[PDB]
Amino acid sequence: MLYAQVNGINLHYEIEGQGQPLLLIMGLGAPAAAWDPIFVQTLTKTHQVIIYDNRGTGLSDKPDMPYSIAMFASDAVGLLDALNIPRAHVFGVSMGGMIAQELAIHYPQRVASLILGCTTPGGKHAVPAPPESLKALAGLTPEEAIREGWKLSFSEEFIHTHKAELEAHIPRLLAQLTPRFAYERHFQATMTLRVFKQLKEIQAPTLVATGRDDMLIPAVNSEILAREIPGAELAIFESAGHGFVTSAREPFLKVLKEFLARQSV
């Protein structure tokens, strides 16, 4: 129901809670509805949490044009401008983490602190998973694509013991599908990231976090990020993968809240 007009397009967002602003940036082809709800609701107790649909996703406009990480970052800053927020804590997951890096480099004045979740600096120094594995875009229903996607983010035992919790998220994901053309624009956007050499210039206090057994974005990329960014802290969660925000939710909340309690806008 709420929209901000940014760079000539409409971006759907939701904002909740009181406290310092915390902007959450979601990954490849994923709308705000993809956020773990307990994670987001818990953060609203201490922070004013902003979530949103990147262009191409959810209820935002979906222009069929080349997308880039710079463009996504410009959209995020424009959202903050529309909300009249001069400075925000930024947490980005996966491609959202790439957007966050771009924000910290090119718009440092807008970024109070930086949290980089299961992400990568891209380029020849990064380690990707096979492009093949990013086929959670098949011949499958959207529902069965989501269930197959869980195998990339969660262990078999986690999927078994948390079945009801995972399945309850399906309707929220199916409510606004990312169309194939937009998904491809997001995928190509991931190859426009040119930040490795500039990571050392990031001034924001930084936390880098991932699951050790991430099969989609190898966890070594977090070690690379943490090494390059001055003063960056590193949190690797042991029995967890790409879906660590869900499968390591309480340990990550504890680390994230402790990090944020030492920060300000």
- Count interface residues toward ligand J3J (CB under 6 A): 5
Question: 16, 143, 148, 167: which one contacts ligand J3J (CB under 6 A)?
Answer: 16
The string of DSSP letters for 110-166 reads: GEEEEEEES----STTS-PPPTTT------S-HHHHHHHHHHHHS-HHHHHHTHHHH
Q: Does 38 bind ligand J3J (CB under 6 A)?
A: no
Q: Residue 48 or 101: which CB sits closer to ligand J3J? A: 48
Residue 169 backbone dihedrals phi, psi, to 5 degrees: -80, -15
**Number of other CB atoms surrounding residue 158 within 10 Å:** 19
* Residue 2 beta carbon to ligand J3J: minimum distance, rounded to whole angstroms: 9
* Residue 46 beta carbon to ligand J3J: minimum distance, rounded to whole angstroms: 12
Question: 9, 15, 146, 234: which one contacts ligand J3J (CB under 6 A)?
Answer: 15
Residue position matching structure tokens 């086929």: 135
* Residue 101 beta carbon to ligand J3J: minimum distance, rounded to whole angstroms: 26
Q: Does 265 bind ligand J3J (CB under 6 A)?
A: no
Sketch the per residue contact string, 44 through 63, with ligand J3J: x for CB under 6 A, - otherwise.
----x---------------
Question: Near ligand J3J by CB under 6 A, which window of 16-24, 57-65, 94-102, 214-222?
Answer: 16-24
Question: Near ligand J3J by CB under 6 A, which window of 13-21, 33-41, 187-195, 253-261?
Answer: 13-21
The Cα 218–Cα 133 span in angstroms is: 12
Q: Residue 88: left (phi > 0), alpha (psi -120 to 50), or beta? A: beta
Residue 11 backbone dihedrals phi, psi, to 5 degrees: -110, 120
* Residue 42 beta carbon to ligand J3J: minimum distance, rounded to whole angstroms: 15
Question: 4, 11, 17, 60: which one contacts ligand J3J (CB under 6 A)?
Answer: 17
Q: Does 81 bind ligand J3J (CB under 6 A)?
A: no
Residues in CB range of 77: below 8 A, 6 or more apart:
103, 107, 110
Question: Near ligand J3J by CB under 6 A, which window of 9-17, 28-36, 182-190, 246-254?
Answer: 9-17
Q: Does 24 bind ligand J3J (CB under 6 A)?
A: no
Question: Near ligand J3J by CB under 6 A, which window of 11-19, 136-144, 194-202, 203-211?
Answer: 11-19
The Cα 125–Cα 220 span in angstroms is: 11
Residue position matching structure tokens 């109070």: 112
The first and second tokens of residue 135, run together, are 């086929």
Q: Residue 45 or 200: which CB sits closer to ligand J3J? A: 45
Neighbouring-strand partners of residue 21: 48
CA 79 to chain CA centroid, Å, is: 16
Task: Provide the binding-site residues for ligand J3J, judged by CB under 6 A.
Answer: 15-18, 48
